[PDB]
Design a protein around this ligand. Sequence first.
Ligand SMILES: [Cl-]
Lengths: 431, 417
Amino acid sequence: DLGTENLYFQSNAMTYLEIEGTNHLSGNVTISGAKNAALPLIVSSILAKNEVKINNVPNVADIKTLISLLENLGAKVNFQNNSALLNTNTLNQTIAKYDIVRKMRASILTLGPLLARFGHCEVSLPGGCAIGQRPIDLHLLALEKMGANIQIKQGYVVASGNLKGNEILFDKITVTGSENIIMAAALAKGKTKLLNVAKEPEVVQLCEVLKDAGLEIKGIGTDELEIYGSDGELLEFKEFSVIPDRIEAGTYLCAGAITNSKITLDKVNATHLSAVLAKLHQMGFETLITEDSITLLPAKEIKPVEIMTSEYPGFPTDMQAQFMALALKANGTSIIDERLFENRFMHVSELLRMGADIKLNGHIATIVGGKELNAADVMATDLRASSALILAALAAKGTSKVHRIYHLDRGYENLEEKFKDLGAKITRLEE
Amino acid sequence: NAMTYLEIEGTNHLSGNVTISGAKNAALPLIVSSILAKNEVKINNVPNVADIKTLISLLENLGAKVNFQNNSALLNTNTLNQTIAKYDIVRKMRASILTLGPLLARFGHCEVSLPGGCAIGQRIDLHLLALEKMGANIQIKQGYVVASGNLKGNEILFDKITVTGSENIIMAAALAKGKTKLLNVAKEPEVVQLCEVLKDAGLEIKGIGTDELEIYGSDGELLEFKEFSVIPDRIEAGTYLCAGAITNSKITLDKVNATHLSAVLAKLHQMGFETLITEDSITLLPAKEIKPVEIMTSEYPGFPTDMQAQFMALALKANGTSIIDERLNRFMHVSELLRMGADIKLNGHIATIVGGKELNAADVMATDLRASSALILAALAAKGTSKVHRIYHLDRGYENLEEKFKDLGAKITRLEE
Ligand SMILES: [Cl-]
């Protein structure tokens, strides 16, 4: 999911965003291709005997890193105008100790395809693996069910053996684990049956592409897949476009709502935002869909909302912060119920400095909307929190300053240009 | 000194007493807290496990004079010198980040290795943001944290309930300049003991046991510690209770605090097992029929996620359908129970157990401590002789685990793999 280290804290070379508030918005914003779909779709070219064409690919750091890793392993690549060309005919793995760190982070997606196609694969134990403990993120248990022999012998995890189909149960709903095992099953011998499979549109596209490429797969879109493996034979890929970034789209919608403004989104799929559109409706905003486009209409009054995060197709945790920001304008008390898994409320402290009335009680945030928000100097954290602070700034009185935008820039390309075209008064300055 | 495994015969019935050890998760922060003591600190009822020894040895490497025998430790950090703590025994230790707070606060800077911990993908760490709010300058070069600056009191909000974050910031606030206010603080008994010890040692602290603490920092002045015993290990206790329940047997636990297991005792009651408390001891009585249970994990004092697996194992003997609702892995033990004939179905984050079916013995691979506990329990109730491999997480969590089950009557034996 993430392609580099904790460079967030390195604030010697850095920039920040200055945003003036209380400006009505207007116009159109084109939604980019989903970063989380593109990553597994690029890793999937490991399964293609021919040239793979992929369109609507966001030009972000993680995409570039992945492409460069495949080049280092022999793949012939090209990437321009959000379109990539992949050919893994010459792909070969390198000696366990070559591109060490790059291969360790990408192993959550590449481990499966590489072990399946090439019969073996080595990944380095991260720092923090006490004698014995194997990485639980890799789905090592899953691959063992498919006949893989796994061992820890020189500071690395060494997987080997020919993969065969089997019934595999996911201990928890995992987007990357699903994608990693879907690609392993694709080349294994015989039929694989996956249970408790993530239903996210990103997983669905992966399956659709493989199906379109000749693989027998049933249950697409459900939590239970049946895959008839090609028994080592690579597939004939066909050109396709990466799906629109539903989170990015959700965030532009909240920008239109929090400023209580008419705006329109292009190159967007409403079917992937069901839960989000329903909540915007619960808050008084009418939605209007015309295939690849969505238009948001202002509300008479912004009404409070109750949100509980869950796995797709429920309300996405990746939109929780943007809705907390919008709930600040609602005429009444809102409630947001989150999962105690990876902070998730990093944006709260910074909103308090903008005069927000927010109280945390364990995993549940109570928002008392109505107060006028005041501008402030805020420190952004993850992508999620970063989106929320920009939204709050657009509705607050005065000029705000959003610092530490490292996670935001690695998540979205031309972010200023899009807000600028919608009429927002945003400018980047040197820290 | 190679890998070993456990061979367990499906027991018909247990009986006797089991003494509960001191909580490893309390002991770790309490040992790190001697960094805040100007004199000798005495700590009793300390479990003899790998993480305890490693931590003691880390403090020795930094200058502290130490000793550890018969579950009792002596700590004196009068000679604690440098705050450079970047070794590999420390890198692998998950609880080592607990030292960052005390060392930065007392000495003005420190270097510690990022724990990580087998995960490929990592977090922004919540400890680091918290210390920045207290004026600290943080930087990451290589896989180490370089912290510096003088700490000052401030109002700090925890983005999520975190046991170690709380402990780490409670110790930092203790020596910082001025008043600190902590919000959304974990209420676990482990955090509570830390606060009690510091209060007893002369620190002005209010709200102990609640989710909101108020700390008046001693502005660099160290505290006078008083001798104490680490609290009993509530998870270990919960696990011996499930052993007694899954074998539907009368057993008793000693050196245990029932107040720290209220949610767990309530569920055992919901399943037909009578509980009987007498001072520091609990006695479990068999049920006429084991009844199904509905469990939802939550923050203390609710049902602990650290007992969820042991209850899934017990639900296999219940006459009916049970439900366990978890936080999004936490169900790594499910696959191995299926090979013992269990009827368990996962639907996202909710497991449905259809108890009643007879469990059969099997050759299983344990994973984390949680899963490891569950497999031993299932083995005791299954028919035949099971074999539980990969017990490295179990041995680092409990000492003389065989000896305790043996004394309760279980047929368990350790063999070389
Ligand atoms: Cl108090």
